[PDB]
RNA sequence: UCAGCUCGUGUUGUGAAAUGUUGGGUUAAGUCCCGCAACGAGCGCAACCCUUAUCCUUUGUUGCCAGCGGUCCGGCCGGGAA
């Protein structure tokens, strides 16, 4: 695709963790070690990323919903920006256990967030007796921080794209439970067993994270434009 | 009158069960915040009730007497609404 080994090398995709923290299941994707730090095999990274991008493009063309999951402090704002410029949904703060498997309950929180936003736009807060308004705006802030990116999702997504599979093991487990395909960036210290589409690469570097997110956003934009509530655009 | 006791859905365990409800703080309080495979909800806590402590408005008799006028010195009388 558009991404090539050279720009991943520039970003730092090939850097992993220290050898003592590795998961032995990452041995096929590990190229070697330098200064007691693993080096991911970009020669394997590139085609796997291309295949994941193609599958994401197909999912977007079929009018599917893409959930971008990443809550690390180095990928939160990047994930939010990618999802916003891609018109898909995101979770960039702490994943609530049961967001997908207990969606019938998380829906009520989504509705409460919508109602609080409507009240804020109305102006019932200054009608309220000050302390109640402060409590309600604090609740609005908390609900926006938690479920801001899935407010308009309206149901289970058709695909998850995850940064730091190990950090988001709960989301990946829920997606495996529900049958939702998982594309994920898997570092050398992570277990790739639950991931349908593994992309070995650095998940701690802001440059690499932005590279992955930009490629995914671009490919899903093309996939969406392929249908766009029409025949072919 | 102790701050406790539970449920739904989700998740863990072959199972009895567990989690939530534990943890760091804080409170009279499972009180509240932060964290967190939990997300929410109910009965309890608190508040809504009565009374007491301050002020304002209205009303002023059988209750009151500051300014007045008398007076048998008793708000006693005419009055006054302070
Ligand atoms: K056991
Ligand atoms: K339960
Ligand atoms: Mg990493
Ligand atoms: Mg208990
Ligand atoms: Mg218990
Ligand atoms: Mg309580
Ligand atoms: Mg808790």
Curated annotation (Swiss-Prot):
Family annotation (PROSITE patterns): RIBOSOMAL_S2_1, RIBOSOMAL_S2_2
Keyword flag Ribosomal protein: yes
Transmembrane segments: none
One GO term of the biological process aspect: ribosomal small subunit assembly
One function term, GO molecular function aspect: structural constituent of ribosome
Gene Ontology cellular component list: cytoplasm; cytosolic small ribosomal subunit
Xref: Pfam families: Ribosomal_S2
Database matches in HAMAP family: Ribosomal_uS2_B
Record family assignment: Belongs to the universal ribosomal protein uS2 family.
Known partners and oligomeric status: Part of the 30S ribosomal subunit, contacts bS1. Some nascent polypeptide chains are able to cross-link to this protein in situ. In collided ribosomes contacts ribosome rescue factor SmrB.
Function: Required for ribosomal protein bS1 (rpsA) to bind to the 30S subunit.
Identification of the protein by name: Small ribosomal subunit protein uS2
Gene source species: Escherichia coli (strain K12)
């Amino acid at each position: 695709a558009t991404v090539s080994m050279r720009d991943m090398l520039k970003a730092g995709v090939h850097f992993g963790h220290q050898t003592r923290y590795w998961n032995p299941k990452m041995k096929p994707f590990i190229f070697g070690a330098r200064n007691k730090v693993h080096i991911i095999n970009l020669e394997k990274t590139v085609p796997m990323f291309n295949e994941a991008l193609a599958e994401l493009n197909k999912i977007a063309s079929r009018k599917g919903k893409i959930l971008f999951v990443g809550t690390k402090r180095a990928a939160s704002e990047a994930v939010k920006d990618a999802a916003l410029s891609c018109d898909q949904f995101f979770v960039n703060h702490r994943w609530l256990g049961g967001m997908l498997t207990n969606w019938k309950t998380v829906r009520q929180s989504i509705k409460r967030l919508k109602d609080l936003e409507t009240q804020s736009q109305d102006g019932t807060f200054d009608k309220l007796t000050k302390k109640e308004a402060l409590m309600r705006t604090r609740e609005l802030e908390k609900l926006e921080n938690s479920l801001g990116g899935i407010k308009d999702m309206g149901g289970l997504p058709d695909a998850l794209f995850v940064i730091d599979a190990d950090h988001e093991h709960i989301a990946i487990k829920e997606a495996n439970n529900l049958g939702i395909p998982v594309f994920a960036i898997v570092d050398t210290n992570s277990d790739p067993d639950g991931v349908d589409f593994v992309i070995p690469g650095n998940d701690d570097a802001i440059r690499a994270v932005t590279l992955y997110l930009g490629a995914v956003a671009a490919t899903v934009r093309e996939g969406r434009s392929q249908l766009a509530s029409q025949a072919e655009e």
